[PDB]
Swiss-Prot record, chain A:
Interacts (via the C-terminus) with SPAG6; the interaction probably occurs on polymerized microtubules. It is found in: Cytoplasm; Cytoplasm, Cytoskeleton, Flagellum axoneme; Cytoplasmic vesicle, Secretory vesicle, Acrosome; Golgi apparatus. This is Sperm-associated antigen 17. Disruption phenotype: Deficient mice die within 12 hours of birth with severe defects in motile cilia. Mice also have skeletal malformations. Male mice are infertile because of a severe defect in spermatogenesis. Spermatids display abnormally long manchette structures and defects in the morphology of the sperm head, acrosome, and tail. Additionally, the transport of proteins along the manchette microtubules is disrupted in the elongating spermatids.
Curated annotation (Swiss-Prot), chain C:
One of its GO terms (cellular component) is nucleoplasm. Keywords: Acetylation, Chromatin regulator, Golgi apparatus, Isopeptide bond, Nucleus, Phosphoprotein, Transcription, Transcription regulation, Ubl conjugation. The keyword Transcription applies. It comes from Mus musculus. This is Protein dpy-30 homolog. The gene is Dpy30.
Curated annotation (Swiss-Prot), chain F:
The gene is Cfap119. The chain holds residues 77 to 222 of 333 of the full protein. It comes from Mus musculus (Mouse). It comes from the Eukaryota. It is found in: Cell projection, Cilium, Flagellum; Cytoplasmic vesicle, Secretory vesicle, Acrosome; Cytoplasm. This is Cilia- and flagella-associated protein 119.
Length: 211, 169, 75, 89, 131, 146
């Protein structure tokens, strides 16, 4: 932060004779860009990690005819609670949650206007909710889902019609792999305070081309 | 989306197709199995027979087992039926349907999905239906959607001579 | 609401390429070079090949130092 | 290197390589729709010999030069980085 | 020509409600906007000229046939929309109550067909795809 | 069998196609150049536009020189016209016709030919050509033939 010298500026007018959080930027030789962003909660800030490919935004059309539309991502950002917010190269936005819910928006405008954004939300049990601003889209067929349970350890599977598999164990660990290959594991890790052994919720996000 | 192994071609028919070595008798056995008429009398049956003939001649190397074979084979037939089910454009919907049934044939989860194809193979299968049946989609749409040139006969009642104002009386 | 605001921020960031200097110091080799020196270097090389002075290194450095304002402020 | 090729193309008016159709045909037709097919091909109906006869007649004769698997199964020196780039590419 | 709004009942049962002008001979004649109704159920609502229905207007028959468009001398002429009792509609040019020139036919299922029309024939109507 | 360079698309139209980096804008430019109507009113023009557009897309994917661009576009148009010139099954005659047409571009002997091209690219075509269209020959036959 500099100071503008008022006297120096007041000289140049010759009369005519006529920050709170520092972001760390990390990059991979494969082209992946990583940035740590500290979002202030509306001190305790919530750390949020943004991953993107700058070359995919520049040469959008080359990659459009090379990699599948499901992987045509411009940027993805991971919350401290697990909401993977994906930016696809065509301007749409896809949202992946830790409970199996998937949100999409082809125009990706505002959700609720108190441009008009069209949003589609698929609940983990298969029900679909779609809205275009204030009007709700009806006749949305829910995705068929099936449930299989391990009879030995009691671990319960559920794969939805959109290839969204949900893995839930008896210890509270939830593993969700979406259609795009991104896996969100809601596992747990004990923490010892210096002793008391406390319940510190953790998680893991895995993707074949992202950190 | 359902497992379509031996949905249309069984192991006996596929033994017959595998014993066929040349393309011509392959097409003949297909037309026998496809219940298609002679290709010379109907162009639609000729197109379908050519599609399934290039189905048999291609997949004859790198290797799908007769199981994965009949799987992808019924895949192509089922999406043909789905695409020709309506005359309106349904490229994206049929695309999503094909990909859903694809992952039904690529993911291991009985009794709704079987680990029949490999990952290289499954990406290749994705590469199939993308890469004519949604660009030649207009060709098959024109062929197998009861034509886009329909006739009409009109019978409408015109204006009878309206009763003019009677002369002043 | 937070998710929607993050979506809007990602929209703006995809619409506006982050040209901040510290952000430039992390970009990959090809991306760092393309946004910094590639167009001015290509123009200098074109001028050098069209003119072909006996002092090519000095001429290229002079062109870079002369036309740096046409590529550093456009960003 | 591609900087230099860009300048030479600009001076010689050489149109950039990509947005360019090419060389005609000894059984006869245009360019593309088997980059559709050679990608369409791999999901069809049956056995273990005609995909590469329809991937030597249907994947290029120039790439039909299938060497006897020497590409990647190969010992590379601890300091030979170029031999590694030649395999992944 | 002074224009009057009157409610005239014709001797044959026809009824008219609209604008009218008295000529030099004293005969009252339908000039301007008017609505005509016949005892058989055919009702017209539109413009009038020289005791003849000329210009834009709407016609409805007893059977459900509804025509809507331009008129010149008690007859379908120019652009107009004819709705059949079955729910099908035609939108195109009219010439002497004859469907001629390029037109548009929508069937009872909502499918819309485009092509030439020849009075009572429309061979080779092209389906219009809406995407 | 003649040299089809700068026959249907000249250098200016090709440069216009080159400035169109996106698929949709390039499809619009091709529709403007080929004098084709809107794809929503006729399916034949839509099929032709899609064919040429995807052709340019994959030709982007590989990479060559502009005279090759015009030669390939004009040869595609000519052989499509030949394939649709008659309603009878005419796969092999167009086959051999353009087989002869190759040598008018792949081997250096003027004025009947010119060496604009390479063997690898040729064989690539032999490949892609006999892969697709004479397989889909009936599809275009049912559409563009009386």
């Amino acid at each position: 932060p500099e100071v503008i010298n008022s006297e120096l500026e007041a000289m140049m007018n010759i009369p005519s004779a006529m920050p709170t959080f520092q972001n760390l930027n990390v990059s991979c030789p494969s082209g992946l860009l990583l940035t740590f962003i500290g979002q202030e909660s509306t001190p305790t800030r919530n750390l949020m990690i943004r991953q993107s490919y700058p070359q995919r935004l520049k040469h959008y059309e080359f990659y459009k005819a090379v990699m599948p539309p499901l992987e045509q991502e411009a940027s993805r950002v991971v919350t401290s609670q697990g909401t993977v917010i994906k930016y696809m190269l065509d301007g749409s936005t896809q949202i992946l949650f830790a409970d199996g819910a998937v949100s999409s928006s082809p125009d990706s405008g505002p959700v609720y206007t108190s441009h008009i954004g069209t949003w589609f939300t698929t609940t983990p049990d298969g029900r679909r909710i779609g809205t275009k601003g204030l009007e709700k889209i009806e006749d949305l067929k829910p995705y068929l889902f099936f449930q299989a349970t391990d009879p030995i350890n009691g671990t319960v599977m559920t794969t939805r019609e959109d290839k969204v598999i949900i893995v839930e164990k008896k210890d509270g660990t939830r593993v969700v792999d979406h259609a795009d290959g991104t896996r969100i594991t809601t596992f747990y890790q004990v923490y010892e305070d210096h002793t008391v052994t406390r319940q510190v919720k953790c998680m893991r996000i895995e993707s074949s081309h992202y950190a | 989306p359902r497992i379509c192994m031996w949905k249309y071609l069984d192991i006996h028919s596929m033994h017959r197709l595998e014993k066929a070595a040349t393309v011509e008798k392959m097409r003949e056995v297909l037309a026998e199995l496809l219940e298609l008429g002679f290709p010379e009398q109907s162009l639609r049956d000729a197109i379908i027979l050519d599609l399934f003939s290039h189905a048999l001649i291609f997949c004859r190397q790198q290797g799908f087992s007769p199981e994965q074979t009949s799987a992808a084979c019924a895949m192509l037939q089922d999406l043909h039926k789905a695409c020709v089910a309506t005359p309106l454009g349904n490229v994206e919907e049929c695309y999503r349907y094909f990909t859903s049934v694809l992952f039904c044939h690529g993911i291991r989860r009985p009794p709704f999905s079987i680990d029949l194809f490999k990952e290289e193979q499954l990406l290749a299968l994705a590469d199939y239906v993308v890469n004519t049946y949604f660009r030649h989609f207009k060709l098959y749409k024109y062929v197998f959607t009861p034509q886009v040139r329909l006739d009409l006969s009109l019978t409408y009642t015109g204006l009878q001579p309206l009763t003019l104002w009677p002369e002043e009386k | 609401d937070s998710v929607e605001r993050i979506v809007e921020n990602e929209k703006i960031n995809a619409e506006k390429s982050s040209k901040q200097k510290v952000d430039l110091q992390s970009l990959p080799t090809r991306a760092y070079l393309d946004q910094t020196v590639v167009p001015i270097l290509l123009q200098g090389l074109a001028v050098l090949a069209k003119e072909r002075p006996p002092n090519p290194i000095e001429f290229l450095a002079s062109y870079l130092l002369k036309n740096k304002a046409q590529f550093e402020d456009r960003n | 290197h591609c900087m230099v090729e860009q300048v030479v193309a600009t001076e010689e008016d050489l149109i950039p390589p990509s947005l360019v159709e090419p060389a005609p045909r000894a059984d006869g037709l245009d360019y593309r729709i088997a980059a559709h097919i050679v990608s369409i091909l791999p999901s069809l109906c049956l056995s273990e010999k005609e995909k590469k006869n329809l991937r030597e007649i249907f994947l290029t004769e120039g790439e039909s030069e299938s060497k006897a698997l020497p590409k990647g199964p190969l010992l590379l020196n601890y300091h030979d980085a170029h031999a590694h780039k030649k395999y992944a590419l | 020509s002074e224009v009057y709004k009157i409610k005239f009942i014709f001797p044959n049962g026809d009824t008219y409600d609209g604008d009218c002008t008295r000529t030099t001979s004293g005969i009252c004649e339908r000039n301007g906007t008017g609505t005509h109704t016949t005892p058989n159920g055919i009702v017209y609502t539109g413009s009038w000229k020289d005791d003849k229905m000329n210009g834009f207007g709407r016609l409805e028959h007893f059977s459900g046939a509804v025509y809507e468009g331009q008129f010149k001398d008690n007859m379908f002429h120019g652009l107009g929309t004819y709705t059949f009792p079955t729910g099908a509609k035609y939108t195109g040019n009219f010439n002497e109550n004859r469907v001629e020139g390029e037109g548009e036919y929508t069937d009872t299922q909502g499918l819309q067909w485009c092509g030439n029309f020849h009075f009572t024939a429309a061979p080779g109507l092209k389906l219009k795809l809406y995407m």
